[PDB]
């Protein structure tokens, strides 16, 4: 019984966490009342990984909400599934940070870190075997990313033998109109490269393009981006929430998908892509699903895996299919003399099989790739860092709080070194 | 008299131990509940089978074994198995977290919390014995609880009981049975760590036993039960010398004098014959010279090598069942007039032969058949060096990239361990090449 | 029993040989003897074996000069604890119509391979061992004539291999056996097995207690064999490796999944345990492969409009239960046989 303590910081992180919880509640079979009305034995086979055992068979999530203002904390408490969460799991302040990393990491963040670690320890003590920690947040805000990095560092210092997962979200100009989002994006990346094991990059530019073109939406909002993020998250943790022949361990999965301790960034994808309301279209075969999941269009990141090198790949299918079909497909794809040869799939994919598809779909597939193309994203924000740091724009907001230009130079050097290492390993021999 | 204690760590280790104990109980007639109708000296005393079973007040023959595992899943099957009344609940030790196929974890993180309990249990079990010989540990090299914890326990047993032998029965992994890509990384570490805390080591090539089960036993896809039964048969054929008052290899200290002429070189080659299927119960008959000629075959050995190139340092034959000394002499003359063999002329050991007049035994309903005579040859040879040339090679394939190495350094050990381990491998290879001349 | 070589560059020192030769010199403590190529033509004086070593548990007088069968019964009589008896490769002359009983009651296993005994002869020879638990009659060119009456009702092993005259008509005579728990039939030339006494979905009354059917290296080219094997009442184990239908090629697994799909209680195949995962994989492949034909045979998800023909039922009598286990195949699951342009 491996228990994973879930965490969600910032407005975007809290919203993504709530959406993912509400999505998996319908798959596991737990009504929002806090009881299980599911009719499948496989559902309760691994429910303890994300739910606690209370009196009367009531399942309580393991999430820990954290913020610096109360607005979003109040919206989730009154949401469709706002009763399952414990009232004492909501930690918040009043003033917020103000889209400032120094104010959300060193002042208010470090001020509420005590109350947050209180609940973190209270939750960790109620677990038979703790596996790791998960956090959902963004990188274009102050409170969110600041408190996320601070809590990650604290959990690493107090629990060095625990895995860390961060479903960080990369901002984009087409979604936000804030000028200091590059600075906060650079600092969080520097902190994560030092205190993280897994980082699922979820670009906010790829999701917007998908919602605008694929879904054919006139004016997409955060509701068309959060649904996709929650769907991808549910598709990623399909093995960690249900049985499976493949090894569904978090530590072993991270070890196999983290061959490099600085290139631990993973691009996640999922086909078929659906919107809100309309989700029951058709049932795609295994070949079509594999072709769509490995397509740059079904990628949550703005980078294309084809423009790089495949280091590690993890595929997870769910629906009504046998492992033999997936194995034959994956073996014929790499066969250069077959009639189904492609040029965007490596010669080793960790395939998985499941019998519990999501809601509104009969079959689904998820892919996670440690390709080097993600470096492109690291170069997209870096350029912006050069169009501000050189002019010292809005630097009095950071230096006035306590930060030094020595912290900015170190973060820039770390980002440059990461990009250089990625580009260097991209040119390695494929032996 | 003197008894022995067998510590079974890991999944493969506990499985092999369970198979060995089942075969031992079926041979000695001990029922699952622990009732030996052939035994008459109740309470205690001295017998041939007393070296592996402790007698209680109610006449229960508790196996002298310690099954330890870092996960409760594997031990649950033993606790709820048919032999639940055979082993004592305290002898089964469980853990809450596994090593996730990691040597540093099993040797530092998870090992530091269970090593004390394991040592306390071993001390409690040894308090009843009047004279212990050694510690027959069972592990493999493709996991983190079989290499890390095994080395951690050897380090403590070499200090607590230094005047006791330490035999091992390792399992050489294979690329077809491999469960992880860092499987070699664990192997090298534990191999370098038990060199000065182990007299004789027995390695089982997974591919060799797989091919044996596919060909001899005739199985489409041999499972772990098929390979655990053959390992139990091998262990029984090897331990018959201690379980039946055999003339050859009466104690554990003789294994180092007969099959380990050099301290650093302690990896003999063990082969066994015959291997008949359950379907062909009475199809063909093998003489004492047709089964002793089948133990000089590369495909019949437990490790894929070519002994015909190198030379042998030692040799010990063990026959079990209807075997007349005249037949043994005829087989020796046949092996000495037919096959061409080389031997080290300056070795302080030579050829030895022993016989055990006891009928073979096989698990009823299994894939093996009951034979009339069996042979087991234990011969140290330089050809085993080939088995290393592969392992080390893979290490290099993983050393130029340093992939998955930070996971091992971020748990306890440092970086010089790998250089020391590969430096210990180079010295072993040089010693092998020197002995081969 | 009662009665130097220098290999390489070292001598051969023998240790413990005196203990074994002193343990074997004891004739009153012989638990097993294997007299092979000893040239045994007669039993000798009566009573000598009944007082020298009357506590033998296993005897193997294979490849000897035994002429008449009475010479073997004379030795088996003096041994009041003969648990195993093997006399293969001996041209014995058994009686023509005499039954010798009251001499092999303690016989649990009997082996007479390459002996040349026929069915009428072995029927009377086994009368002396009414409590026989195992019997081996391979490599004898035996031709069954009629079913046994009051003989071989405790035998749980019937090894009929290397016999090219064993057809289904001859197997029906040995299917009445009440305690037969195994039946070996390797290298016999059988090509088909039928059970007209039962229909589709019923259990045949033949082979009541058969639990292991070995037919390796046989003429199994039609799927009708596995389909008819479903009728067996207790067919728990099956064995079949080299047939016109079974290949050692890497593409043979596609057939294995069908075999497990043809039998319902096949928990082990080719000496390999079967799990729920294996059962589900094999059951999903069988439905994925035979869905198209089910549509053409007159199949439809409608529980009242399902009208299938007889040929499709005889070829797939285990396809209707699977239709209810995991529902019927959809239209979008039977369109995966066309490429792209
Ligand atoms: N995809 C997505 N992005 C969001 C969402 N909410 C906010 N963002 C992005 O998050 C970034 C920072 O805003 P927040 O995360 O809400 O802010 P915070 O992290 O609470 O920080 P403070 O405002 O300083 O308290 C911006 O770039 C937004 O575009 C959301 O629901 N979905
Ligand atoms: N012969 C044999 N090899 C086995 C068996 N079980 C596992 N192995 C091999 O042992 C290696 C895996 O090690 P395990 O024993 O399963 O793992 P562990 O040593 O308990 O360690 P952790 O996984 O780190 O807890 C691989 O090479 C497997 O093929 C078995 O029953 N028999
Ligand atoms: Mg906010
Ligand atoms: Mg284990």
Short mmCIF file of C-alpha atoms and ligand atoms in Angstrom, two decimals, chain A residues 9-13 15-16 67-69 72 95-100 104 137-146 169-172 175-178 181 184 202-204 207 222-223 225-226 229, ligand 1:
data_model
loop_
_atom_site.label_atom_id
_atom_site.label_comp_id
_atom_site.label_asym_id
_atom_site.label_seq_id
_atom_site.Cartn_x
_atom_site.Cartn_y
_atom_site.Cartn_z
CA UNK A 9 -0.33 25.62 -4.88
CA UNK A 10 -1.40 28.80 -6.62
CA UNK A 11 -4.70 29.53 -8.36
CA UNK A 12 -3.85 27.57 -11.51
CA UNK A 13 -2.44 24.69 -9.47
CA UNK A 15 -7.82 24.59 -10.24
CA UNK A 16 -5.88 21.85 -12.04
CA UNK A 67 -2.55 29.92 -1.21
CA UNK A 68 -1.75 33.53 -0.05
CA UNK A 69 -5.29 34.92 -0.82
CA UNK A 72 -9.72 30.50 -5.09
CA UNK A 95 -2.56 39.83 0.69
CA UNK A 96 -1.21 37.27 -1.87
CA UNK A 97 2.25 37.87 -3.48
CA UNK A 98 1.52 40.25 -6.44
CA UNK A 99 3.11 38.36 -9.36
CA UNK A 100 6.42 38.70 -7.49
CA UNK A 104 5.89 34.71 -2.55
CA UNK A 137 1.31 24.75 -9.88
CA UNK A 138 2.38 27.25 -12.54
CA UNK A 139 5.53 29.20 -13.43
CA UNK A 140 4.15 32.61 -14.44
CA UNK A 141 2.89 33.71 -11.03
CA UNK A 142 4.37 34.79 -7.72
CA UNK A 143 2.47 32.96 -4.98
CA UNK A 144 2.02 29.78 -7.00
CA UNK A 145 5.56 29.07 -8.23
CA UNK A 146 7.26 30.68 -5.23
CA UNK A 169 2.74 24.96 -16.18
CA UNK A 170 4.73 27.27 -18.46
CA UNK A 171 2.97 30.62 -19.13
CA UNK A 172 2.51 32.17 -22.57
CA UNK A 175 -2.85 33.63 -22.17
CA UNK A 176 -1.46 36.30 -19.82
CA UNK A 177 -0.49 39.96 -20.16
CA UNK A 178 2.00 40.20 -17.28
CA UNK A 181 6.31 36.30 -15.91
CA UNK A 184 9.48 34.04 -12.12
CA UNK A 202 2.69 21.56 -19.67
CA UNK A 203 3.10 24.62 -21.98
CA UNK A 204 0.21 27.19 -21.92
CA UNK A 207 -2.91 24.14 -25.07
CA UNK A 222 -9.22 28.50 -18.71
CA UNK A 223 -12.02 25.87 -18.72
CA UNK A 225 -7.15 24.34 -20.79
CA UNK A 226 -7.83 22.87 -17.30
CA UNK A 229 -4.61 19.22 -18.31
N1 LIG D 1 -3.73 26.82 -17.87
C1 LIG D 1 -3.97 27.68 -16.88
N2 LIG D 1 -3.12 28.68 -16.60
C2 LIG D 1 -3.55 29.45 -15.57
C3 LIG D 1 -4.70 29.31 -14.84
N3 LIG D 1 -4.79 30.28 -13.86
C4 LIG D 1 -3.71 30.98 -14.00
N4 LIG D 1 -2.92 30.55 -15.03
C5 LIG D 1 -1.63 31.14 -15.34
O1 LIG D 1 -0.95 31.25 -14.12
C6 LIG D 1 0.03 32.30 -14.20
C7 LIG D 1 0.16 32.98 -12.86
O2 LIG D 1 -1.13 33.12 -12.23
P1 LIG D 1 -1.57 32.30 -10.93
O3 LIG D 1 -0.92 30.97 -10.96
O4 LIG D 1 -3.04 32.33 -10.82
O5 LIG D 1 -0.99 33.15 -9.70
P2 LIG D 1 -0.51 32.70 -8.25
O6 LIG D 1 0.36 31.60 -8.67
O7 LIG D 1 -1.63 32.43 -7.37
O8 LIG D 1 0.28 34.00 -7.72
P3 LIG D 1 -0.09 35.47 -7.10
O9 LIG D 1 -0.93 36.10 -8.09
O10 LIG D 1 1.15 36.21 -6.97
O11 LIG D 1 -0.78 35.25 -5.82
C8 LIG D 1 -0.39 33.16 -15.40
O12 LIG D 1 0.57 33.06 -16.44
C9 LIG D 1 -1.72 32.57 -15.86
O13 LIG D 1 -1.89 32.62 -17.26
C10 LIG D 1 -5.60 28.25 -15.14
O14 LIG D 1 -6.64 27.97 -14.57
N5 LIG D 1 -5.13 27.48 -16.20
#
